[PDB]
Amino acid sequence: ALLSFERKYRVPGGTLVGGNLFDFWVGPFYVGFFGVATFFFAALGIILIAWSAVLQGTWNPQLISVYPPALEYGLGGAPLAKGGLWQIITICATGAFVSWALREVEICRKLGIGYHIPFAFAFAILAYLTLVLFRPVMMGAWGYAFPYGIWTHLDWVSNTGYTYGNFHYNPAHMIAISFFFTNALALALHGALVLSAANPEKGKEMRTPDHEDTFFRDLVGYSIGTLGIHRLGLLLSLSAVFFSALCMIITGTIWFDQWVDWWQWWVKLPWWANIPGGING
């Protein structure tokens, strides 16, 4: 079933692999080679997870958990029940994501749009790979990665954080968090602006971009614009995620002591390091 305007766009074309072979829809979903790939990977991974949920012995979603190889196993493989499943599921998930991204590319091509979406998605995927591939590998073991469970991945976050004291003092983490927070503020504002214009006071006519620009200039002396605010959402959000992955790729590798102590580079700068008074002397 089609949206009222959909048919004219459902033409052949834009696949990267397989020519016309998988070029078709199932319902609203486009397939394509990478739609098959994705299915395959995701199906496998879910199968294996449901297995792990038997080799551990539960069917509760709040308990199921797939742990990586213990640290003793290094970068080598590990028996299924002791983190091989995880190992394979991690391959499956990467397969499913990258396939999803390439499928997004195929859709773009059939629709004659830019590739900005799957380019953006790629940044979430690199974040995932940092946690389960690039960090662990550079640290020497699959065991440093996080496990696949709802509440258990939270524990990993907590242990991993507190291993370096209060993780707040990781500077890239501070920057990432600034982006996440700003992004949420920008999303809120954008959403509300577009809507305060499209839905004015009872009986008034739709306002205009001119009103939108105007409202922000009145309020804070600047309006970024309608092109700019979408430019910004995308930069805020991608940058939050870039600095996220950065904040962790460096933790346990180029820096491994307590993050709070890292700040002493500032304080011990020679020109003020021994001036009496203040919090530090």
């Binding site: 949206l3 009222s4 766009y9 459902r10 033409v11 052949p12 091509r109 004659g112 006519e205 309608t226």
Partner: protein, 240 residues
């Protein structure tokens, strides 16, 4: 206890919110149709919303949605298969017929107006006193298509007045008429403007505008449609 009560409530709230949000996003394109234009059988669990009415300024009227959906245009495609879900082949030349990635919508055949009732978009020559303020000024550069042939020359920039940004390049062709190229499909270089989406022989094909100092929403759709479509349909002539 209070915390159990507050969260349970919240989930109930959230459920309602999603409902409201999902229904709100069903104001265009629904009801679903079969490939033949008939209303499909399975609409899914979400009903349409009670309609709302936007009052458009400048006497342009109202829009009320949800409303009766039709394409208000011929669609030059035909089925390639005997069951639902396959592609629909172009019956003619898809660039000229406005299908696939060359598709346009039948928008209003008037120009978008600014907050003052004036045309939002003007050629810079009639826009006082707009001027290039930074970056390479494209005016006068030859235009090159993906076949690496010169298809014309830039003769103005059409600009969005209230937002003060560039939106098309007006280009003069071998025969002396012009076409609008969307700003976003041209790469301005030091000694030329480059356009990957179109081979040079496909410029003449770009839909034209009825009055030469304004462009209607409808015309913008035909143009942007056409130029984008070139990525797919002039792949034989690209070359990169």
């Amino acid at each position: 206890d209070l915390a159990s009560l507050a969260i349970y409530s919240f989930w109930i709230f959230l459920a309602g919110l999603i409902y409201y949000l999902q229904t709100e996003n069903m104001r265009e394109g629904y009801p679903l149709e079969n490939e033949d234009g008939t209303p499909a059988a399975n609409q899914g669990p979400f009903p349409l919303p009670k309609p709302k009415t936007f009052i458009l300024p400048h006497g342009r009227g109202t829009l009320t949605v949800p409303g009766p959906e039709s394409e208000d245009r011929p669609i030059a495609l035909a089925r390639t298969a005997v069951s639902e879900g396959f592609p629909h082949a172009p019956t003619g030349d898809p660039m000229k017929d406005g299908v696939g990635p060359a598709s346009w919508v039948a928008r209003r055949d008037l120009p978008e107006l600014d907050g003052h009732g004036h045309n939002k978009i003007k050629p810079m020559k009639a826009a006082a006193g707009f001027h290039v303020s930074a970056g390479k000024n494209p005016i006068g550069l030859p235009v090159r298509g993906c076949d690496l042939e010169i298809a014309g020359k830039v003769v103005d920039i059409w600009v969005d007045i209230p937002e003060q940004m560039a939106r098309f390049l007006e280009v003069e062709l071998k025969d002396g008429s012009t076409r609008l190229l969307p700003m976003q499909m041209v790469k301005v270089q030091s000694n030329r403007v480059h356009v990957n989406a179109l081979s040079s022989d496909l410029f003449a094909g770009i839909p034209t505008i009825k009055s030469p100092t304004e462009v209607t929403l409808l015309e913008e759709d035909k143009i942007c449609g056409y130029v984008a479509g070139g990525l797919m349909y002039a792949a034989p002539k690209r070359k990169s």
